[PDB]
Write a protein that binds this ligand. Structure first.
Ligand SMILES: [Mg+2]
Ligand SMILES: [Mg+2]
Ligand SMILES: [Mg+2]
Ligand SMILES: [Mg+2]
Ligand SMILES: [Mg+2]
Ligand SMILES: [Mg+2]
Ligand SMILES: [Mg+2]
Ligand SMILES: [Mg+2]
Ligand SMILES: [Mg+2]
Ligand SMILES: [Mg+2]
Ligand SMILES: [Mg+2]
Ligand SMILES: [Mg+2]
Ligand SMILES: [Mg+2]
Ligand SMILES: [Mg+2]
Ligand SMILES: [Mg+2]
Ligand SMILES: [Mg+2]
Ligand SMILES: [Mg+2]
Ligand SMILES: [Mg+2]
Ligand SMILES: [Mg+2]
Ligand SMILES: [Mg+2]
Ligand SMILES: [Mg+2]
Ligand SMILES: [Mg+2]
Ligand SMILES: [Mg+2]
Ligand SMILES: [Mg+2]
Ligand SMILES: [Mg+2]
Ligand SMILES: [Mg+2]
Ligand SMILES: [Mg+2]
Ligand SMILES: [Mg+2]
Ligand SMILES: [Mg+2]
Ligand SMILES: [Mg+2]
Ligand SMILES: [Mg+2]
Ligand SMILES: [Mg+2]
Ligand SMILES: [Mg+2]
Ligand SMILES: [Mg+2]
Ligand SMILES: [Mg+2]
Ligand SMILES: [Mg+2]
Ligand SMILES: [Mg+2]
Ligand SMILES: [Mg+2]
Ligand SMILES: [Mg+2]
Ligand SMILES: [Mg+2]
Ligand SMILES: [Mg+2]
Ligand SMILES: [Mg+2]
Ligand SMILES: [Mg+2]
Ligand SMILES: [Mg+2]
Ligand SMILES: [Mg+2]
Ligand SMILES: [Mg+2]
Ligand SMILES: [Mg+2]
Ligand SMILES: [Mg+2]
Ligand SMILES: [Mg+2]
Ligand SMILES: [Mg+2]
Ligand SMILES: [Mg+2]
Ligand SMILES: [Mg+2]
Ligand SMILES: [Mg+2]
Ligand SMILES: [Mg+2]
Ligand SMILES: [Mg+2]
Ligand SMILES: [Mg+2]
Ligand SMILES: [Mg+2]
Ligand SMILES: [Mg+2]
Ligand SMILES: [Mg+2]
Ligand SMILES: [Mg+2]
Ligand SMILES: [Mg+2]
Ligand SMILES: [Mg+2]
Ligand SMILES: [Mg+2]
Ligand SMILES: [Mg+2]
Ligand SMILES: [Mg+2]
Ligand SMILES: [Mg+2]
Ligand SMILES: [Mg+2]
Ligand SMILES: [Mg+2]
Ligand SMILES: [Mg+2]
Ligand SMILES: [Mg+2]
Ligand SMILES: [Mg+2]
Ligand SMILES: [Mg+2]
Ligand SMILES: [Mg+2]
Ligand SMILES: [Mg+2]
Ligand SMILES: [Mg+2]
Ligand SMILES: [Mg+2]
Ligand SMILES: [Mg+2]
Ligand SMILES: [Mg+2]
Ligand SMILES: [Mg+2]
Ligand SMILES: [Mg+2]
Ligand SMILES: [Mg+2]
Ligand SMILES: [Mg+2]
Ligand SMILES: [Mg+2]
Ligand SMILES: [Mg+2]
Ligand SMILES: [Mg+2]
Ligand SMILES: [Mg+2]
Ligand SMILES: [Mg+2]
Ligand SMILES: [Mg+2]
Ligand SMILES: [Mg+2]
Ligand SMILES: [Mg+2]
Ligand SMILES: [Mg+2]
Ligand SMILES: [Mg+2]
Ligand SMILES: [Mg+2]
Ligand SMILES: [Mg+2]
Ligand SMILES: [Mg+2]
Ligand SMILES: [Mg+2]
Ligand SMILES: [Mg+2]
Ligand SMILES: [Mg+2]
Ligand SMILES: [Mg+2]
Ligand SMILES: [Mg+2]
Ligand SMILES: [Mg+2]
Ligand SMILES: [Mg+2]
Ligand SMILES: [Mg+2]
Ligand SMILES: [Mg+2]
Ligand SMILES: [Mg+2]
Ligand SMILES: [Mg+2]
Ligand SMILES: [Mg+2]
Ligand SMILES: [Mg+2]
Ligand SMILES: [Mg+2]
Ligand SMILES: [Mg+2]
Ligand SMILES: [Mg+2]
Ligand SMILES: [Mg+2]
Ligand SMILES: [Mg+2]
Ligand SMILES: [Mg+2]
Ligand SMILES: [Mg+2]
Ligand SMILES: [Mg+2]
Ligand SMILES: [Mg+2]
Ligand SMILES: [Mg+2]
Ligand SMILES: [Mg+2]
Ligand SMILES: [Mg+2]
Ligand SMILES: [Mg+2]
Ligand SMILES: [Mg+2]
Ligand SMILES: [Mg+2]
Ligand SMILES: [Mg+2]
Ligand SMILES: [Mg+2]
Ligand SMILES: [Mg+2]
Ligand SMILES: [Mg+2]
Ligand SMILES: [Mg+2]
Ligand SMILES: [Mg+2]
Ligand SMILES: [Mg+2]
Ligand SMILES: [Mg+2]
Ligand SMILES: [Mg+2]
Ligand SMILES: [Mg+2]
Ligand SMILES: [Mg+2]
Ligand SMILES: [Mg+2]
Ligand SMILES: [Mg+2]
Ligand SMILES: [Mg+2]
Ligand SMILES: [Mg+2]
Ligand SMILES: [Mg+2]
Ligand SMILES: [Mg+2]
Ligand SMILES: [Mg+2]
Ligand SMILES: [Mg+2]
Ligand SMILES: [Mg+2]
Ligand SMILES: [Mg+2]
Ligand SMILES: [Mg+2]
Ligand SMILES: [Mg+2]
Ligand SMILES: [Mg+2]
Ligand SMILES: [Mg+2]
Ligand SMILES: [Mg+2]
Ligand SMILES: [Mg+2]
Ligand SMILES: [Mg+2]
Ligand SMILES: [Mg+2]
Ligand SMILES: [Mg+2]
Ligand SMILES: [Mg+2]
Ligand SMILES: [Mg+2]
Ligand SMILES: [Mg+2]
Ligand SMILES: [Mg+2]
Ligand SMILES: [Mg+2]
Ligand SMILES: [Mg+2]
Ligand SMILES: [Mg+2]
Ligand SMILES: [Mg+2]
Ligand SMILES: [Mg+2]
Ligand SMILES: [Mg+2]
Ligand SMILES: [Mg+2]
Ligand SMILES: [Mg+2]
Ligand SMILES: [Mg+2]
Ligand SMILES: [Mg+2]
Ligand SMILES: [Mg+2]
Ligand SMILES: [Mg+2]
Ligand SMILES: [Mg+2]
Ligand SMILES: [Mg+2]
Ligand SMILES: [Mg+2]
Ligand SMILES: [Mg+2]
Ligand SMILES: [Mg+2]
Ligand SMILES: [Mg+2]
Ligand SMILES: [Mg+2]
Ligand SMILES: [Mg+2]
Ligand SMILES: [Mg+2]
Ligand SMILES: [Mg+2]
Ligand SMILES: [Mg+2]
Ligand SMILES: [Mg+2]
Ligand SMILES: [Mg+2]
Ligand SMILES: [Mg+2]
Ligand SMILES: [Mg+2]
Ligand SMILES: [Mg+2]
Ligand SMILES: [Mg+2]
Ligand SMILES: [Mg+2]
Ligand SMILES: [Mg+2]
Ligand SMILES: [Mg+2]
Ligand SMILES: [Mg+2]
Ligand SMILES: [Mg+2]
Ligand SMILES: [Mg+2]
Ligand SMILES: [Mg+2]
Lengths: 102, 92, 66, 97
RNA sequence: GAGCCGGUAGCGGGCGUGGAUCCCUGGAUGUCCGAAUGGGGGAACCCGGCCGGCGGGAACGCCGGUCACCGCGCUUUUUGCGCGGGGGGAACCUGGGGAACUGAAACAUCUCAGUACCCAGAGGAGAGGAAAGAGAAAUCGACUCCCUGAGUAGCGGCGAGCGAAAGGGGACCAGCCUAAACCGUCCGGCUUGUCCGGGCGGGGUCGUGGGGCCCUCGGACACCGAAUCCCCAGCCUAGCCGAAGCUGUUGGGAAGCAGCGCCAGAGAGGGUGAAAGCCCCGUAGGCGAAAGGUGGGGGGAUAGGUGAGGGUACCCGAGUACCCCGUGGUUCGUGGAGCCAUGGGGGAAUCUGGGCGGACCACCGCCUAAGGCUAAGUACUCCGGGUGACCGAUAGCGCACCAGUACCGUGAGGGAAAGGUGAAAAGAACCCCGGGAGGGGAGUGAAAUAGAGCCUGAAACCGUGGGCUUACAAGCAGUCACGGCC
RNA sequence: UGAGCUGGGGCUAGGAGUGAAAAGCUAACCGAGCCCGGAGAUAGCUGGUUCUCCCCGAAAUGACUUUAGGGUCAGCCUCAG
RNA sequence: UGCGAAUGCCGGCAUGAGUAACGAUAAAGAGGGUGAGAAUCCCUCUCGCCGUAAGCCCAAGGGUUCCUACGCAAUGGUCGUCAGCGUAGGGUUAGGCGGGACCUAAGGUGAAGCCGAAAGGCGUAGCCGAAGGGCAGCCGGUUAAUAUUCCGGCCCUUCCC
RNA sequence: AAGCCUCUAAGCACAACCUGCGGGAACCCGUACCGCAAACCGACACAGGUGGGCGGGUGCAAGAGCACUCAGGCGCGCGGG
């Protein structure tokens, strides 16, 4: 069921695309669409809703999802692939240098 | 299960007009019998039921583009509360 | 979660008591319905919880008779 | 149900062959066939009323196995039931094993 | 192991590391119809008996439970009780039945064909199977299946055509239980007895014939051993670990190009804005079951099995063998016609008995009929998976799309069309014309003749504009010449 | 007012029904209903049979044929040695 | 594996053509209203046609077509502001009406029983089977839409105690 | 054929059935609307087909006939010349 290699908390860097380079906290993960939303790829929605709440308002600037592959997690270094290590309970994501978050 | 025999109050001009006399109408279970609805209302609203009228309400056919279907069939009971009594739960 | 507690409470508790409790929640449900029926007088998720909660008692009642 | 209750002989299917001409073994050019058609051969079924216990029992059997009915009648041993002693006289007493 | 309350956003609410959604196993609940099974009935509805419960509850209604039929077994026909059956399944299998077109360049025998199909039954397979067999070798050894033998031997209006077996090479491998003589026992019938019969137990199972009974020898710890039970490994039903790259550059986007690197038991493959071994998912290599299924493999039990000689002549499957009439099967279509099967008639014997080696007889041999079971090698593919000098939306399944649907038909039945915006909805706020539809700006986008009647967008077909041309000429419309005008 | 008409409930069917008889009717075509199947029946008949260039190039006769607008052998074309 | 022909197959678009036709010759006219738009919707008046019907009530069959609000892309042989059309909401009330916890008819089914290769075919009783038999409600009022059903008045049936 | 009345049998006759009064109990299904038709059978808002009841008045010998008319319903879903 959709493996997925980054979570809500994580601090990812956008490895490719237009926001190649940027670094951000993934706000939301969307396993169904295999995508995450970070702080890159944000766009300009025409906010019709002039009538309901959000009057006058012509537009909005929500942040669009990103193919989950477009991002990589980081820690005292750059991005890493992920290695999983077994303790004496269950496993945890350790980068290819140290470890990932408390 | 008596709260299973009685589904919901039927909310309509016609239904409301019934409150004047002791006549309250409910959506009931379609397999529920008149005798069963008496006791069901009797123990649900601590009232004496005196007359029970029922009728089936066929589902309306409705489509949503391409796909056309039907809404569930229903049953209405118009119940006659004894002289002087009242279902306060419906008087709103 | 809040549920496992209720499950423990329900288990170890007489069938007669279980039937009593069911009949009760069953009545509460009817009330949730009528509120929802006249609209804007309810808040969904409760109709589901209770409906699903009435199931839990009935399944434990089953164990206690089986 | 044109079947022997004892031997189990039942009607079979056989051909009726119309031959003509003089046999070859008689200086004929040989026999010729002008038709072959299907027909049944029924076993020679007959009724056999025989008194057993207090009751009258009727077997539908091939004439060939009529003897068997009376042999099955010899075997006697406690049975005041209904017209269904044959149920007992039958395979129960036929070959059993 | 961090997100979740299906497709499905939204409104309105909620749940999750105190481990949710989700996945696997087991259990619970499971209206009504349907074999449908209390009884009816025009399936999904209607009406009851009995016991118990609920409501004030006798009338009424609801809830739980129970009640069809048939077979077998007990049992006292009593009357019950227990057990089972029933119906369905793509194809495969066996049995009971069983065509025609067609072929014979007509047609009847023959063919198509024991096919199609109908019916019954079975199961993961089914059939078959332990010689009354083959058939010329003093031979072989159950059955099934493949190759071969062989288009041979033969069959055949000797036409059309049909078509074996032995033997050899392989796959698989296995052999058993009974009936009877004899003995014990319980029981029933009576014309009471070393009587007859049924029921159980022992006994016995064979073709260098075997067994029973009598005597002699020595008859055993053993030795073999399941197709049955038990345990276990292994396997299926969820999963998990899994190496190695950064920078610059063009670009809407890098995976392209360039510069230095690295992994490889992994350079299959699929994604990521374009073309990535080293970004993502995987791949090589490993790992994993509390529960259910399996378990043909290893182990262990149990059932079961195992003697020699002599005599006696007791037993060795009956409406059977055998013969004859009528037919089927076999390559054998009446043929010299055997063999196996059997509707009809007649009708034995128990080893010195019986069947067979293609009429018959002799001789010489083979085999022991009239009881039953038996794994595996074999057939199929509803189902899961893996592969493709397989299709790529007129193809491929009828169906890539809510299709056995819409629709057609009283019904059996027939039966379609219909895929693609973009990398991302960023799916065009606002303004103008309009009742809307639609369009014009603005805006998004790398692109908007990618704007949702959306990738590419051919042809017929319809238009708007322009050049040349045409109202005294006539024709398969073109062609060869000249000339004009653009 | 009759061998009358008609509603409703029933029964009879494919070589079969039913028919005051026409081979009428049996679900809008009945000298043998419809559906699915044997089935891709058979069709010595009819139609159709798709890129290019190069060389050669016929026959419409004879015999026999339930044969005569179909065939078998020969004759005539082509290719190889 | 190459298409131009098979009255080929599937699809698209042409010609005839602004042509035939717009479905009974009972028949129309005006004023006013609504509306972006009106011969076609609403209202008034005049005219015409049915009247053993072309009016009304049952049974079949049909199955939301019913009433109301908001609508006109399509369906309507034109047009529609209207509709039997789109969206939504509402609407069918019974001891006495009809049918069933009644009866039997043809026929169907079918314990007994009979027959048939299998499938199955018969068949006494019984059971099923109705627009026949049997059985207790008449007059008004009321809703946008149901009424012998709700209400009012008068009147009856069966069951239990 | 049942309802119904009568007759008696097993049984039971401090039951039972009958009459009268009183109290209580009385379930499932249908019920909208069209229905000689634009809502049913005819691919259609199709000049066809579809069973039972009511179907007023005047006149004409009578009548359900014919003419005109009540109630009620319609001028038939392209129009103008
Ligand atoms: Mg790495
Ligand atoms: Mg854990
Ligand atoms: Mg009702
Ligand atoms: Mg004969
Ligand atoms: Mg001779
Ligand atoms: Mg023949
Ligand atoms: Mg004889
Ligand atoms: Mg949903
Ligand atoms: Mg939400
Ligand atoms: Mg929270
Ligand atoms: Mg856990
Ligand atoms: Mg489960
Ligand atoms: Mg379960
Ligand atoms: Mg039933
Ligand atoms: Mg009771
Ligand atoms: Mg019950
Ligand atoms: Mg079985
Ligand atoms: Mg079966
Ligand atoms: Mg069957
Ligand atoms: Mg057969
Ligand atoms: Mg067969
Ligand atoms: Mg059979
Ligand atoms: Mg046969
Ligand atoms: Mg023939
Ligand atoms: Mg041939
Ligand atoms: Mg022929
Ligand atoms: Mg021929
Ligand atoms: Mg012929
Ligand atoms: Mg044959
Ligand atoms: Mg079968
Ligand atoms: Mg196998
Ligand atoms: Mg087997
Ligand atoms: Mg066998
Ligand atoms: Mg043997
Ligand atoms: Mg042997
Ligand atoms: Mg000869
Ligand atoms: Mg043959
Ligand atoms: Mg061989
Ligand atoms: Mg061999
Ligand atoms: Mg062997
Ligand atoms: Mg004895
Ligand atoms: Mg014995
Ligand atoms: Mg024994
Ligand atoms: Mg033994
Ligand atoms: Mg001997
Ligand atoms: Mg991994
Ligand atoms: Mg990796
Ligand atoms: Mg740039
Ligand atoms: Mg790069
Ligand atoms: Mg490089
Ligand atoms: Mg590899
Ligand atoms: Mg591109
Ligand atoms: Mg691409
Ligand atoms: Mg490359
Ligand atoms: Mg390249
Ligand atoms: Mg790659
Ligand atoms: Mg590179
Ligand atoms: Mg592996
Ligand atoms: Mg694990
Ligand atoms: Mg493993
Ligand atoms: Mg296990
Ligand atoms: Mg084993
Ligand atoms: Mg073992
Ligand atoms: Mg032993
Ligand atoms: Mg001996
Ligand atoms: Mg001896
Ligand atoms: Mg023998
Ligand atoms: Mg012989
Ligand atoms: Mg002989
Ligand atoms: Mg013979
Ligand atoms: Mg033969
Ligand atoms: Mg012959
Ligand atoms: Mg011969
Ligand atoms: Mg022969
Ligand atoms: Mg023969
Ligand atoms: Mg012989
Ligand atoms: Mg023989
Ligand atoms: Mg015989
Ligand atoms: Mg001998
Ligand atoms: Mg032999
Ligand atoms: Mg010989
Ligand atoms: Mg002879
Ligand atoms: Mg032999
Ligand atoms: Mg044997
Ligand atoms: Mg077997
Ligand atoms: Mg498959
Ligand atoms: Mg491809
Ligand atoms: Mg297509
Ligand atoms: Mg297709
Ligand atoms: Mg395409
Ligand atoms: Mg398929
Ligand atoms: Mg198709
Ligand atoms: Mg579908
Ligand atoms: Mg139709
Ligand atoms: Mg239909
Ligand atoms: Mg397209
Ligand atoms: Mg796309
Ligand atoms: Mg793409
Ligand atoms: Mg404006
Ligand atoms: Mg625009
Ligand atoms: Mg623009
Ligand atoms: Mg721009
Ligand atoms: Mg462009
Ligand atoms: Mg534009
Ligand atoms: Mg373009
Ligand atoms: Mg376009
Ligand atoms: Mg484009
Ligand atoms: Mg288009
Ligand atoms: Mg594209
Ligand atoms: Mg396009
Ligand atoms: Mg022009
Ligand atoms: Mg002139
Ligand atoms: Mg001129
Ligand atoms: Mg001219
Ligand atoms: Mg010319
Ligand atoms: Mg020129
Ligand atoms: Mg008469
Ligand atoms: Mg009639
Ligand atoms: Mg016929
Ligand atoms: Mg006839
Ligand atoms: Mg006539
Ligand atoms: Mg006709
Ligand atoms: Mg054929
Ligand atoms: Mg022919
Ligand atoms: Mg040449
Ligand atoms: Mg030449
Ligand atoms: Mg010819
Ligand atoms: Mg020639
Ligand atoms: Mg030469
Ligand atoms: Mg051509
Ligand atoms: Mg064509
Ligand atoms: Mg199209
Ligand atoms: Mg013209
Ligand atoms: Mg004209
Ligand atoms: Mg005209
Ligand atoms: Mg007209
Ligand atoms: Mg006006
Ligand atoms: Mg105005
Ligand atoms: Mg006017
Ligand atoms: Mg006007
Ligand atoms: Mg008009
Ligand atoms: Mg109706
Ligand atoms: Mg509708
Ligand atoms: Mg209306
Ligand atoms: Mg309106
Ligand atoms: Mg419209
Ligand atoms: Mg319009
Ligand atoms: Mg129109
Ligand atoms: Mg029309
Ligand atoms: Mg308007
Ligand atoms: Mg409407
Ligand atoms: Mg009443
Ligand atoms: Mg009425
Ligand atoms: Mg009634
Ligand atoms: Mg009752
Ligand atoms: Mg009856
Ligand atoms: Mg019958
Ligand atoms: Mg029968
Ligand atoms: Mg039978
Ligand atoms: Mg009845
Ligand atoms: Mg009746
Ligand atoms: Mg009546
Ligand atoms: Mg009545
Ligand atoms: Mg009255
Ligand atoms: Mg009305
Ligand atoms: Mg009224
Ligand atoms: Mg009243
Ligand atoms: Mg009776
Ligand atoms: Mg009396
Ligand atoms: Mg007495
Ligand atoms: Mg009374
Ligand atoms: Mg009352
Ligand atoms: Mg009504
Ligand atoms: Mg009405
Ligand atoms: Mg109408
Ligand atoms: Mg009406
Ligand atoms: Mg008419
Ligand atoms: Mg009428
Ligand atoms: Mg009317
Ligand atoms: Mg019209
Ligand atoms: Mg009409
Ligand atoms: Mg019509
Ligand atoms: Mg006429
Ligand atoms: Mg009429
Ligand atoms: Mg009159
Ligand atoms: Mg009159
Ligand atoms: Mg008069
Ligand atoms: Mg006068
Ligand atoms: Mg007159
Ligand atoms: Mg009259
Ligand atoms: Mg008249
Ligand atoms: Mg009038
Ligand atoms: Mg008209």
């Amino acid at each position: 069921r959709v493996k997925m290699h980054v979570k809500k908390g994580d601090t990812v860097l956008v490895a490719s695309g237009k926001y190649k380079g940027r670094v951000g906290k993934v706000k939301e993960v969307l396993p169904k669409k295999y995508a995450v939303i970070v702080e890159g790829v944000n766009i300009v929605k025409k906010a019709v809703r002039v009538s309901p709440k959000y009057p006058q308002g012509g537009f909005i600037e929500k942040e669009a999802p990103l193919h989950a592959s477009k991002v990589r997690p980081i820690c005292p270094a750059c991005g890493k692939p992920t290695r999983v290590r077994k303790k004496f309970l269950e496993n945890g994501k350790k980068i290819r240098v140290c470890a990932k978050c408390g | 299960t008596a709260y299973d025999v009685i589904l919901a109050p039927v909310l309509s001009e016609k239904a409301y007009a019934g409150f004047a006399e002791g006549k309250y109408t409910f959506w009931v279970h379609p397999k529920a019998t008149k005798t069963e609805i008496k006791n069901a209302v009797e123990t649900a609203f601590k009232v004496k039921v005196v007359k029970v009228n029922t009728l089936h309400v066929r589902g309306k056919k409705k489509r949503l583009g391409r796909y056309l279907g039907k809404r569930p069939d229903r049953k209405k009971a118009i119940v006659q509360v004894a002289p002087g009594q009242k279902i306060e739960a419906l008087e709103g | 979660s809040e549920v496992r507690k209720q499950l423990e409470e329900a288990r170890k508790l007489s069938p007669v008591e279980l039937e009593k409790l069911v009949r009760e929640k069953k009545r509460e449900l009817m009330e949730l319905r009528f509120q929802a029926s006249i609209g804007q007088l309810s808040q969904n998720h409760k109709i589901r919880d209770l409906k699903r909660q009435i199931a839990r008692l009935l399944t434990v009642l089953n164990e206690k008779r089986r | 149900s044109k079947v022997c209750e004892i031997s189990g002989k039942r009607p079979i299917v056989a051909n009726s062959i119309q031959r003509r001409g003089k046999a070859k073994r008689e200086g004929g050019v040989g026999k010729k066939t002008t038709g072959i058609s299907k027909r049944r051969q029924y076993p020679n079924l007959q009724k056999v009323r025989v008194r057993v216990a207090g009751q009258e029992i009727t077997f539908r059997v091939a004439a060939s196995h009529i003897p068997k009915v009376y042999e099955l009648v010899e075997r006697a041993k406690g049975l005041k039931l209904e017209g269904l002693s044959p149920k007992e006289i039958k395979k129960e007493l036929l070959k059993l094993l």
